[PDB]
Amino acid sequence: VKPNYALKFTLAGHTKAVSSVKFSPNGEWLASSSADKLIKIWGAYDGKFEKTISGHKLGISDVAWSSDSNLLVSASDDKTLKIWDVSSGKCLKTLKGHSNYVFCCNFNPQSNLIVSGSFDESVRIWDVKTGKCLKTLPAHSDPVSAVHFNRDGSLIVSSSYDGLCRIWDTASGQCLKTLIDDDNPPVSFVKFSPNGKYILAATLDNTLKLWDYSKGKCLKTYTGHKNEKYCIFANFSVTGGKWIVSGSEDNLVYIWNLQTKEIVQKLQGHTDVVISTACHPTENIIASAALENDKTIKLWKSDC
Amino acid sequence: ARTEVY
């Protein structure tokens, strides 16, 4: 099998580089964050502008949806996170605690917690209801590039430019495991597989790796793309064929066969680094977003 | 920050 993603929409709304695009769990919306201090909500199927959400004092590096698709959390250079009522665009909570740029964020599957990573080299765990920081994990020795809950919510995976990938116990905050590469390249992105068994880790040596963190063995390796400078999102595509999907610094979207590790498709259209890619929860739809020279969001549809 | 090179 081979995917046939084709360009359906190009969304131009941000005046600065886009940083992150995420689909709502209910499949209705796409949220985009940008260096222009703004969040925008679009229709996932038609690209129709729904709303602009503002309030952050500086640029935004990441956004994430709650499981009920009602809340958004955003991570900003203004050292804070913000919890937003999507339907009103009102800031429900301002998460204060980090001492530098907040770079990455995610809700847990229950959506009672938020995990954040920061340029202050720490990973924080916040209570959604009260907005209070529950835990501060002294996670890394460099800016935290990604943070992600497993499907059970009990584990938090984190990555950093320091070369480490860590598995943390959510309940205790203890570093349950530490993945180590002897060559130690900066880890620019990490994410649990949709089964919690593996983690997909990007390193700034033009490499993606599917790791079994338990045994500490690299199961898969995906190459061909360019990634040496930016923290580019990667994804497990599961609605059709089992793909690995990632942006690239050569302006392309790369799609690999997960098992064979072969590049099965390259999506062309962006004219700057494709910093972000996301996969629709139910449909074979990919969203992509690019940096300053581009500033657009693109939606791609495939049959398989 | 994500849109800039560290």
From Swiss-Prot, chain A:
Its main location: nucleus. There is a cross-link at K16 (Glycyl lysine isopeptide (Lys-Gly) (interchain with G-Cter in SUMO2)). Changing F119A: Significant decrease in interaction with KMT2A. WD repeats lie at residues 13-52, 55-96, 98-138, 139-178, 182-223, 226-266, 269-303. Interacts with PAXBP1; the interaction is direct and links a WDR5-containing histone methyltransferase complex to PAX7 and PAX3. Interacts with HCFC1. Component of the ATAC complex, a complex with histone acetyltransferase activity on histones H3 and H4. Component of the SET1 complex, at least composed of the catalytic subunit (SETD1A or SETD1B), WDR5, WDR82, RBBP5, ASH2L/ASH2, CXXC1/CFP1, HCFC1 and DPY30. Core component of several methyltransferase-containing complexes including MLL1/MLL, MLL2/3 (also named ASCOM complex) and MLL4/WBP7. (Microbial infection) Interacts with herpes virus 8/HHV-8 protein LANA1; this interaction regulates the MLL1 histone methyltransferase activity on viral DNA. PROSITE patterns: WD_REPEATS_1, WD_REPEATS_2, WD_REPEATS_REGION. Keywords: Acetylation, Chromatin regulator, Host-virus interaction, Isopeptide bond, Nucleus, Repeat, Transcription, Transcription regulation, Ubl conjugation, WD repeat. Belongs to the WD repeat WDR5/wds family. The gene is WDR5. It is found in: Nucleus. It holds the Pfam family Beta-prop_WDR5. The modification N6-acetyllysine is found at K82. One of its GO terms (molecular function) is histone H3Q5ser reader activity. GO terms for cellular component: ATAC complex; histone acetyltransferase complex; histone methyltransferase complex; mitotic spindle; MLL1 complex; MLL1/2 complex; MLL3/4 complex; NSL complex. SUPFAM superfamilies: WD40 repeat-like (SSF50978). This is WD repeat-containing protein 5. The record marks D77, F103, F233, E292 as: Important for interaction with histone H3. The keyword Acetylation applies. One of its GO terms (biological process) is regulation of transcription by RNA polymerase II. Contributes to histone modification. May position the N-terminus of histone H3 for efficient trimethylation at 'Lys-4'. As part of the MLL1/MLL complex it is involved in methylation and dimethylation at 'Lys-4' of histone H3. H3 'Lys-4' methylation represents a specific tag for epigenetic transcriptional activation. As part of the NSL complex it may be involved in acetylation of nucleosomal histone H4 on several lysine residues. May regulate osteoblasts differentiation.
